[PDB]
Amino acid sequence: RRGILVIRHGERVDQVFGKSWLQQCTTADGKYYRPDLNFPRSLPRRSNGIKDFENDPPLSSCGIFQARLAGEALLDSGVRVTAVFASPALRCVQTAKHILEELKLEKKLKIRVEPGIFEWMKWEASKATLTFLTLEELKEANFNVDLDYRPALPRCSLMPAESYDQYVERCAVSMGQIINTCPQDMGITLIVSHSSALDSCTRPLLGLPPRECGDFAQLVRKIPSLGMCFCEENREDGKWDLVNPPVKTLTHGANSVFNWRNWI
Amino acid sequence: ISRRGILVIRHGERVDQVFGKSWLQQCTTADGKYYRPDLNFPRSLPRRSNGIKDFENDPPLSSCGIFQARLAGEALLDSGVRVTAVFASPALRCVQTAKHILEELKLEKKLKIRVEPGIFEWMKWEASKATLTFLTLEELKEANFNVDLDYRPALPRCSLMPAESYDQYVERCAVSMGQIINTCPQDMGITLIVSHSSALDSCTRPLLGLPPRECGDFAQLVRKIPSLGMCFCEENREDGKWDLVNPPVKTLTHGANSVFNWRNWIS
Structure with missing residues (x-):
């Protein structure tokens, strides 16, 4: 049969360190460092500043462990994965990526970013207070995204x-x-x-x-x-x-x- | 200059810490084989004398435990420090933790794990009311832990009271x-x-x-x-x-x- 598997993203840094997380890992000097191992090895290359991760935070190390462990289990289950869609939120796209890497399909399948499945705007912040990575930036940060996919709802259409x-x-x-x-x-x-x-x-x-x-x-x-x-x-x-x-x-x-x- | 240092490190999360004393029963078949009822149970158990029954008192790292050991290993690599030797408690969770640290340090081959019963848990807290066994060096070597077969422990396993x-x-x-x-x-x-x-x-x-x-x-x-x-x-x-x-x-x-x-x- 044909199936749909809806998957929540892994642990996000701000779930552990709070809203202040970004301040805890940024030098006076302005740079990123890991004050605790659960902060990721590095942050992806981003426009509008490191400042933008505040409203669009990355996976924690645990988050990545979680996404990999699930990916691995999907490989082991023997199931056949044919496509992946992901919310534009960085935590989602990262999760999609690590699942694929453990499935060994990161090259074979391209991630389709679909703003239509993004978080309920109510729990998030307004437009002027919320921005996502562009496909280009993701492609550059090494996420094999589908550059051709036409979203059912484009990013700026989110009210x-x-x-x-x-x-x-x-x-x-x-x-x-x-x-x-x-x-x-x-x-x-x-x-x-x-x-x-x-x-x-x-x-x-x-x-x-x-x-x-x-x-x-x-x-x-x-x-x-x-x-x-x-x-x-x-x-x-x-x-x-x-x-x-x-x-x-x-x-x-x-x-x-x-x-x-x-x-x- | 550099100095000489000792880094004592606690093992990673053990399965029974999450799933309780019944853990072994939860991941054993009516048949008698191992399976993962939850992803946090490891991919597999190492080869063991008495088959599966001995893990009860000497349990393995959970998947999370492994993640933790690896993360720390990686961090030690990144820190740039020089690790020259590793000693580990004979408990499986300890030896596993040492192994994963080394793998992330890229020294699993270069350094051999020296198992030292002298640094085992306080016997008071160990249900050697069932009798502790551990794995033998041979079994570890076979389970692919680069153990030091020559290391003479300051306290051999059977000397633990x-x-x-x-x-x-x-x-x-x-x-x-x-x-x-x-x-x-x-x-x-x-x-x-x-x-x-x-x-x-x-x-x-x-x-x-x-x-x-x-x-x-x-x-x-x-x-x-x-x-x-x-x-x-x-x-x-x-x-x-x-x-x-x-x-x-x-x-x-x-x-x-x-x-x-x-x-x-x-x-």
């Missing part, structure tokens, strides 16, 4: 004040186009997105109405990094069925800050 | 550190001691010429040590005294990842 109902509609519209981007291949398509997407990108396929707004927010906070939601298409009925994801869940503990001076 | 007191524990640690520090005391590099939480105190105090902490004070401090937690000592040129200093790599802080199941948590 920094969309309602819940507009969000779920744009998601349904985006899923629409994706499902019709060559509906033939009998493989799995990856949608690497955010917590909310596990509900807002599957319900339409399942022909279900949007959850009540309160009911929705309540469910999407419970979703962990690399959390998955799997949908399959029935041959004849053409209906979509919610099924078990092809890889196991990932459960592990935190690691709290330590200091050998804080002995006594 | 399953009822040692706190005072005996700290003394055996001091005695072991003793021999380690005299195992060619010349090279101006860093020696890794990959061991347990307790070792960050029990293996550095003697070097620092400090008396053992009060037992309660000691237990209270060692639960606060995280995976890959480090404690660094340097030797003064003249004095010959040891100084407690900042570890050559940053700390590693990250969040948990709780069990999920969508179809269910929806209703």
Whole structure:
């Protein structure tokens, strides 16, 4: 059968170090350094400054570990991946990348950046306070992105004040186009997105109405990094069925800050 | 100039830390083979005498544990420091942690892991009520850990007394550190001691010429040590005294990842 696997991005640095993260890793000198190993080895090359990561943060090292471990598990599962779409958020695109690298398909498949599956604008910041990397920058930062892919919703079309109902509609519209981007291949398509997407990108396929707004927010906070939601298409009925994801869940503990001076 | 240093490092996350004492049962088939019921269980278990049953009291690194060990290894590479030797507790989680550190340092082939029962966990906290076994050097060599087959431990495995007191524990640690520090005391590099939480105190105090902490004070401090937690000592040129200093790599802080199941948590 043909399947859709919705996947949450891995741990993001600001989930661990807070909004101040960017200040914690930037020299007076203006440069980046790792004050803690969980900060990534390096940041990708970016316009409008290091200053832009603030609203579009990268994966933590743990995040990368998570994305790789899932990728590896998809390889091991024997499943066939035929396409990957990702929210323009750097945490998503990075997650897509590491999954592919462990699947050994980073060269074979090109990441399709789809703003239509971006986070609900409400939880994010306004337009004047939110910017993504350009395909060019990603290509330069070594993400094998599809330069030709025409998004169901271009980046500037995202309204920094969309309602819940507009969000779920744009998601349904985006899923629409994706499902019709060559509906033939009998493989799995990856949608690497955010917590909310596990509900807002599957319900339409399942022909279900949007959850009540309160009911929705309540469910999407419970979703962990690399959390998955799997949908399959029935041959004849053409209906979509919610099924078990092809890889196991990932459960592990935190690691709290330590200091050998804080002995006594 | 450079100085000579000792870096005590706690092992990475162990599976039973996450999945509990029942872990072995969760990843064993009705058949009797191993499988991964969650991605945090490792890809595979090493080849072991008695098959699978012995892991119960000597568990492996979780996937996360491995990530942690690797991350630190990489950081040591990046720091530019020179590592000249590694010693590890016989516990599998320790030997695994040493291995991954070396692999990221690119020295797995160049340096051989010296297994030293003298720096094993305090026996009080080890259910050698079941009887500890460990892996043998041979089994490790076969499981592809470049162990030192010639290294004569300051305390051989069977000399560990399953009822040692706190005072005996700290003394055996001091005695072991003793021999380690005299195992060619010349090279101006860093020696890794990959061991347990307790070792960050029990293996550095003697070097620092400090008396053992009060037992309660000691237990209270060692639960606060995280995976890959480090404690660094340097030797003064003249004095010959040891100084407690900042570890050559940053700390590693990250969040948990709780069990999920969508179809269910929806209703």
